[PDB]
Amino acid sequence: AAPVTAANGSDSESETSESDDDSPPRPAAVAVHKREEDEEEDDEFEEVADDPIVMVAGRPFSYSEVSQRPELVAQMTPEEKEAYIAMGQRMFEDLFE
Amino acid sequence: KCQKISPEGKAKIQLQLVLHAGDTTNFHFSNESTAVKERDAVKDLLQQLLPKFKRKANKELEEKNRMLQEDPVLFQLYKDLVVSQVISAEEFWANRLNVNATDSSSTSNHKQDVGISAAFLADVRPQTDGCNGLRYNLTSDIIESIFRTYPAVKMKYAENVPHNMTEKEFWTRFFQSHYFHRDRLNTGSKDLFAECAKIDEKGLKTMVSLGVKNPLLDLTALEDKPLDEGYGISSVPSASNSKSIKENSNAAIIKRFNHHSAMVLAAGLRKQEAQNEQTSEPSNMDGNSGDADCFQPAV
Amino acid sequence: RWEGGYERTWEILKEDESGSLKATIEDILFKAKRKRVFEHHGQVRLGMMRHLYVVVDGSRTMEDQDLKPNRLTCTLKLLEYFVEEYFDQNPISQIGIIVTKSKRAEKLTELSGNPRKHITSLKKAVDMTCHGEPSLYNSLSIAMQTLKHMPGHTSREVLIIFSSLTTCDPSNIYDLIKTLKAAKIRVSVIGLSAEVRVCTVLARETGGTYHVILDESHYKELLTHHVSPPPASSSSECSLIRMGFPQHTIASLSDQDAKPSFSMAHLDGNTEPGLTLGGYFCPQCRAKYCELPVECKICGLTLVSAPHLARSYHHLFPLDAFQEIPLEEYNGERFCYGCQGELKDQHVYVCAVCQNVFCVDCDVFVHDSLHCCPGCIHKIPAPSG
Amino acid sequence: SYEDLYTQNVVINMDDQEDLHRASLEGKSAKERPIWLRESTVQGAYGSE
Amino acid sequence: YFPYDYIYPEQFSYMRELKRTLDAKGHGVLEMPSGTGKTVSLLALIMAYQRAYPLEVTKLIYCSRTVPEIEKVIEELRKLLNFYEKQEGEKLPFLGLALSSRKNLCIHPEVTPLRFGKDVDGKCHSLTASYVRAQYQHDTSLPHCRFYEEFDAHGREVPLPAGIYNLDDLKALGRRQGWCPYFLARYSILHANVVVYSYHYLLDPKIADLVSKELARKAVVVFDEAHNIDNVCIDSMSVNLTRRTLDRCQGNLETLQKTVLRIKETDEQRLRDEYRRLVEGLREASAARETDAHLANPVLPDEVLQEAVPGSIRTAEHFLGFLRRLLEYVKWRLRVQHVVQESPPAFLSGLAQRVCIQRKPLRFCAERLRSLLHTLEITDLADFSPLTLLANFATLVSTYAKGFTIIIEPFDDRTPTIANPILHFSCMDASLAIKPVFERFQSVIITSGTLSPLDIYPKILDFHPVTMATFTMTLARVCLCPMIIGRGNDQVAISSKFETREDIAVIRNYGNLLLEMSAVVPDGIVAFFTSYQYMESTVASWYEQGILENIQRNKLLFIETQDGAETSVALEKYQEACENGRGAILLSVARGKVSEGIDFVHHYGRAVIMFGVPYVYTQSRILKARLEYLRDQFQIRENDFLTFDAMRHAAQCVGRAIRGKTDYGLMVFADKRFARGDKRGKLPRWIQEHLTDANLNLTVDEGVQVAKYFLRQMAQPFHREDQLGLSLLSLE
Ligand code: SF4
Ligand SMILES: [Zn+2]
């Protein structure tokens, strides 16, 4: 009845997103640690990085503190092992990737 | 980025938070209650506890059935009238549900913001800082703004991922210096420089096709007429050529000028294709201090 | 070298009593008061039905220290008076509240004619945070899609009020002007400080006006002009049929508590339940519900009665005042037609039909509520009877 | 156009959320709650009025 | 009477000034600010004169400074022609000639779209009067320059063209029936009631033809925007030479040697036959059009250049005489660029001792070099343009080195490094380019708005009995709003005349005030800095503290570049964003390229920001010589000359955002140096109408509150305001 058919919208469509990540699991154990002493044997300033708390045998410890010791890797409950892999999406995502 | 503390030998205890633009702010602790046990707690609780975010991965739809699926409360009414074979499906989408499906239809394809010159330019500054340190993406599509500013990324992501490489090694190549925006990349600076040259060439042809007032075109012929260039040669007399300063402070500003000025023009050509011709009204030439408001409608 | 100039400056500032002898601050006050501009614009329309979508800005610029340290409580509080005055002179018409925040356009209230729903909804926006980055193309494109459902017979104007931001153009609004004209809609823009040229052309092509608020007293005067419909005349918007003429009932006979009252549970008026005393009903459907002039849910048209519904639109139609005539002989009955007494201080206002003398208290009530002249009853129906 | 590098990556993940506001109450208790003093006149109480 | 704009009143004051000029017969100075209609009111009084039947001889050549303003003058002169063409009934004919040469020339597609002007016009003239004058008719060589031959036809004939034309009117007529801008320009100069062009043609003692008759006390000349005349009268006759241009001049000279070497005896006799005609003759037919291209009259403040081609007796003999002027010049120039030296008699007397010739062949060698290729003429200007720069430098020595100077700045001194040496040879007394102009015509009237300090005006050493300012009576003073911010007793750090990045107090104040103004100005902001050095140090300092990043949120950034190719494309992006979307911001230099003449108005840029006093670098030796010579004439005025040049460029950046009255522009002088100097060499209409109120000792916090008065009161003038006259001059 009225030749209008203008509708709405001008340039807002595309396909939203749903293509930001979704990658198969590849990494596992971290190997980065930076430094913890006092730079080149200096003073005042010190390098401090990041290291989340992982559950090992019910005792709270750092994530990188356990990965450096092979004796504390195979001695843990299987329920905490699924969380050990999920925690790997921090240093593998901040660095490299 | 990174934080710094004080050792056991230093008597002072200061906290330094290194940002990303080179701004370092010191924080000298002065907690008289517990400081030896808390100067490390601030260090420990900032490295043992880090926030995260969620990325939704679900197939979306475009039909009107999406409005009922997203709301479990509203979906119960559709099962009591259409599924219960008491009425017809056309009667429900006429007067019972008409004031809600109209407003919900606009937020089904709304990509953050439609504007780019004012409604989105005030929020594009914290989004164009693609660095590392500790920053992380959000739930919403935060990488869509790069597609609107860097058209070459859209083609390189669909023609090479997951073709040659995957998402595990691709985004960090283009984001090697997003704050710098003109770094060198072995992944393809050849495709990035060719895409930026095409946008600058397409945007230049639009201004030449219009041409309403270009005083700079006659400035070149005005100086070249008397066969004298005693003023055009001495353009930037910084007096620092071997020190790498004249071609350093000036290059870091002009290069960023072509990235910000052409960003608004490139987003405008993908909306109306330069068909408005900039209003083009004869009232622009008229500059009289009078008016012509004499016709009064409905009087 | 500060005391060398500070000592001599105090000598001049201390003798400030000499400036009071001159009549500088007095002669300007009497000359600035006599500046009475006269730009009577015929703002009137025969169309009785009006659809409006008031756009309220919710950006971070709504907290500037201009008229008051809290601008957020200046627009929301004064908007309640515009809604109450809108239903007072135009009860059959309805408005809408659409906010804008976080680069989004979230429609608050729907298209209903409930005065209590629009007033109480503005008080909730006090706790609403002001992020920033307002969007005009988002709050304008959504309002056109909802307004398209209305039949072509009304002015269907749109009101936009923002904090006078430096060109609130998201991404080329001039391309939308060619689209808004096809919908036969109108856009009204109100400024608060800086001039907005990108919206001045929009208010001229679609059909409206553009004004900038200068003081707290100027914001109330501009809202009064928007109560009247915009002056225009079209040909494709002049068709309408089936007008609802409800009747007022009490749903009782002698006592209200002895009867099941009105607007209860089993009654069909389940839109606004509670405990009232009476309401309206459709003469073609016998559906009793709230007495507010709203669109019914059994026919598909609003209620336009006659006693205190359609008369409010005609009461504002005769917008006219009175003229004056100077003289140097002191004569003219000096007896008011309404309050007898006058003022006797150079104030003579006569009528253009019956020629009656009024005082300073009667002329204000005419242009504000009376809208006519008492002498038009004892002179015009005189020869016809 | 120069070149820059060192520590320039992108972080992506999909987790977190679900119960986060419940922890704000415990951390706020470490400061001080807004409360007056134990008013006691041991004589006649107030009457609003 | 010209009914158009409302009556202030203003044409009553301009009418009396035009009457005393014809009686006194001398140069006049008239102040015409940009806030007053200097085009509608001026053109309304000028055509009343064009109809002067009594005034025996009446002319106007009117100039301007930019190629758009030419067109602006045209259109405005169109309409006032329109209305009292209607009003006075029966119309008498007219002509206003926009005479644009190079950049508005050729309709042939092979020639047109090559970017520059001069070189491509050399291709044009090489085709017309170098190949088709030599190869006088053929089939391919003698190119289809067919409407030059149409000019031949209608230059034998007599048409009468219609009225004043645009620039594009003459190209559209090119297509239809208007012919060549140059040649129709010639036929229309033969009789033209008004010719509009740029004053750079007259104020240039080189290719200036004065486009006038032999009368020395007639005609009327009207200048426009002639406030910056101290540098035009010097930079025009200034000549320079670089090692890159000298290397090309020597390379192309060897090609000419191979041309004469391959000539036998039959063709060589024809070259010597024309040498006898040029001596016995003096009105050669080649002096009609080729004179304007080559060095016409370099001795403008003297007489014409016409001798008996001295310094030449044979064809090959002239080549050796010119070769010695190049092999010895390269030995004298490279030896003096080792250390700094400034001595006018060092180059004049040093060249005469080495090259043992006379001052007659060195003076006429520029004209003989052009006539040498006219006999063979198989050449073109592309190979002759490097040879012109060398002949032009030698002309300014035999008859101009007795009053000039030589500035040598080789080792890092506002000049390129050792990779490209350059020497300087400019003037000091800016009067040699304007004295023949005042003597060839009757009276010259300059119209400048920014030229208000008239006490320093006798710098040109010329009389000016007609002196009058302009106040412009206006009811509401919401037109302009000058503000001066200089901190005061809070930080006092706002000036930086000899500081780079040694402090951060002045740079922080420039970013805090600019960030607040970017959110209150309704349209665009056109800011200006001091020089290119302080501008780059201020923007780079905002990247560390985080000041420029916040500006990118609101308005779009636009900073003037160095190359001229990227500057024209940058202004087009600014005009598109300010009209379509939100008005952007301009961060340029007061003496850059967007300060010559952009004529930006309300929809482009209605806010002006001045970061400090736009001074000049007086430490350089290219400018110290221009000021040292002033001490011989004015001893006490050694400091006032620097104040004039600083306030002239400051008012030039301000007198552009407004053109009529309803533009409503804003200007800010964020500097503490504007204390007492605002009551001397400034606009007279700003002291009584604006600078009277206390608003000079403002700070960053106070400057925002004062700026809100101009941004809020401007909303009141909307329906009607100052409407006086009623299209009849109020019966005055
Ligand atoms: S003369 Fe007229 S046409 Fe022939 S070259 Fe010059 S412009 Fe091109
Ligand atoms: Zn009904």
Ligand SMILES: [Zn+2]
């Ligand atoms: Zn009365």
Ligand SMILES: [Zn+2]
């Ligand atoms: Zn009456």
